[PDB]
């Protein structure tokens, strides 16, 4: 029933609307969700999907970029 | 790195206007850009913000639904379409590149003025003391003109003189300014002091001679 | 809706002295990414703003060592270790942590500190050229004073009038670093001719005695 | 156990190596897989993931583009 | 490894006539995307190739209506409804369906068809300047013939020699549309002086009689 | 739309060379580009292919591991780094833009020649008939030279003459060409015919007079 990426009991929903960090983080928060945790997803198959989308630390998952827009995943436990 | 605004001018309330911001010296489509305005109070107020591709736009509450920020990445030019202009929109408008979380390079600005006032020439009144000291200060009152930019040039018999130009004040839809000249007491009234007041917008030049 | 509050509004400094400008935000400017997005700009007269310091304490390209930013959370400071002539103008702090909107401090005008100077005060009766067309503007020049803070009172037959008073101040004089102002009292011809004595009165920190310039319509 | 997108009994594996169409199609074929079917994925949540990657009809999932490189998903039934 | 085979190699056409060039691939050029990626290029003398027709039958910008492409699968055709002077040069077909590699046909040279012309044949003995340094090059010019296909035989004392024969052909003459060739027989001075009679013999469709040019070393 | 190759030249076997392809009139980083070579046999042979960003490269089997195709999108220039060059790599090298599945615009090309042969001046031998007709054909044999480009210019007593220039043939590492001139029988030997043979690469000009 996870319409997105399923990993270790969590469900990652792709939001393809480009948003600034605050707006993305607030969007997930309202959906009872968080942004992805960089260290959780970095050494998994999820990295190919989540790369250069907003992490919970405020940066794109891998110069200053806090004023730019990125896509984002909302993460919610099952 | 260069950014050049243009399109600024005088418009009536409810009017429309498009400002441009031509850029040079960097890859334009790689950068997010702001419009920021400077009010008559000389405060800085953010107006709009656009992403590098132009897919994301943001507006301050005061221009929301009236202004449109867009870009042409082929022409390296940023735009600000202004409609339903109010007197509150009167400002110098700056385009500013985003870098490092800040606005790193700004243009020289373009000036916008929203007013229903009609082009009016100034009345010029010579200010002379009634009926003493090493020097004498004289004036010319420049009253009820529109739009701004008048130039008061003083002719005296003396090279040593100081001129004070007092910034215009908006009074009853129209501007009023003053200018003073201070000269040695041995050169006035013994020699002629005149103020020449030029108002380019009305194509008028008025000379007043200062009489005791 | 992050309010940036800058103090002071004007900072009088002499050349070679240190200056410090305060900027305070309504909420913390620490970004979840560890950085703090507070920036300092300088606007010189007749020029657009230029970036001086980004993210609290980083000097932008070409910005000299004498400028240093500091602070954290809500309280920030711009220090100028030794003030030079080219530093004069208006400094603006800005925040880009809580966005939109991007917000700016009101500004701090760095100005030249000089010796005190009492104003040269001149009063002028309405010209007949104005009078005969039904207006009466009485003008008072207050020239070359320091510091900027001055009080001007208009007295008609000894009593103060606040009706129709307009005041215009110059920016700091480039020749001698003083200030000047113009004060105009606007009355109608009829109301002007109902009174005799016209006075502009200036109180300044340079004297405990007000500077008085008057004229009598019957003199 | 689907390390990718799971939809209606199929598993969509993201290949983030940009490839020409033939090389991508042959890559999936060797992995007992096909490229995504445009009409299957177009009206689903998968569209946000599969957009502008290789479809089984030879075009990116939405000027000539047969000489360009795109990323691709390999689809395999469970 | 898709082999593109073009026929003919040379196509003799007169001005105003229609021309048709064949191009055949080793496997079908239909792309899974419905399109067929066969393309036609024109290379004019001293110029780089230019695109004429892309994807079987689409004319590129500026390419006139008289050029039409057609075909499907493995068999394709370029038609020129009426041949003009500016069309002359080499046409190349190309495939981009099965890639890499991108492959090109060998080419078809569009040429001017004129009346038949027998070659003007001249033979030259080795100059003494070559002989005295130990070489013997015997040269035969075959000038202004049409068509291109000709046979040249070298005879020494009546017998054919294939050893050390080099042939060079001109491109089509711009003045009269003919062809010319040079044939050199290279022997050593010693071997040259061992024989008497040297002959270059040309058979051409213009005559059933060979054109014979000889010289005798003792004449 | 323009593409300009450069860097072509003469190199020894095992040598290295870098070709460039400067572009103009279109947004360079939006387009995939090929290198295509034209052999001495005048056949077209694809060499390499690069994506718009440069993240993908493809090579023909014959240059695989020897040639490197790269690009600089800031400079609108394409590169071909050639190492371990063989005589088989001798060609005119074209850069060609990809569009519509085809190669839509090509440069003028740059010429590459791989050879260990040393710069050698031609021997010039006059070709005159042994010991008839309205005209007489004469020749000059230009033998054993390197590199290519020789120019044979004929001087005669007659304005009416045709000159045939026969393409060079590679014989024992060296080129040999011929040139013929046909003149009326009333102008030779009665007037002087000479062939002037210039070989720029060896700084040599040789005149042969045609003697009966
Ligand atoms: Zn959502
Ligand atoms: Zn916030
Ligand atoms: Zn002054
Ligand atoms: Zn009164
Ligand atoms: Zn795979
Ligand atoms: Zn294939
Ligand atoms: Zn000819
Ligand atoms: Zn023999």
Residue numbers in the entry:
A (entry chain A), D (entry chain A): 99 to 160, 169 to 184
B (entry chain H), F (entry chain H): 2 to 132, 136 to 216
C (entry chain L), E (entry chain L): 1 to 219
The authors write:
Among those, A33 is a 23 kDa, homodimeric type II transmembrane that undergoes both O- and N-glycosylation (N125 and N135). The crystal structure of the ectodomain of A33 revealed an unusual C-type lectin-fold domain, similar in overall architecture to several NK cell ligands. Using X-ray crystallography, we mapped the A33 epitopes for three different antibodies and characterized their VACV-neutralization potential in vivo.
The A33/A2C7 complex shows two Fab molecules symmetrically bound to the A33 dimer, consistent with our SEC data. The buried surface area (BSA) between A33 and the LC is 365.1 Å2, while the HC buries a total of 334.1 Å2 between A33, leading to a total BSA of 699.2 Å2 between Fab and A33, which corresponds to 4.9% of total protein surfaces. In contrast to other available VACV antigen antibody complex structures, including D8/LA5, L1/7D11 and L1/M12B9, the LC appears to be as important in antigen binding as the HC. For antigen-antibody interfaces, Sc values of 0.64 to 0.68 have been reported, illustrating that the A2C7/A33 interaction is very specific. This interface is held together by an extensive network of hydrogen bonds and salt bridges involving every CDR loop. Gln173 is a major contact residue of the A2C7 epitope and intersects with of almost every CDR loop. As expected, we observed complete loss of A2C7 binding to the A33 Gln173Arg mutant. Interestingly, the Gln173Arg substitution is found in ECTV suggesting that A2C7 would be unable to protect against ectromelia challenge.
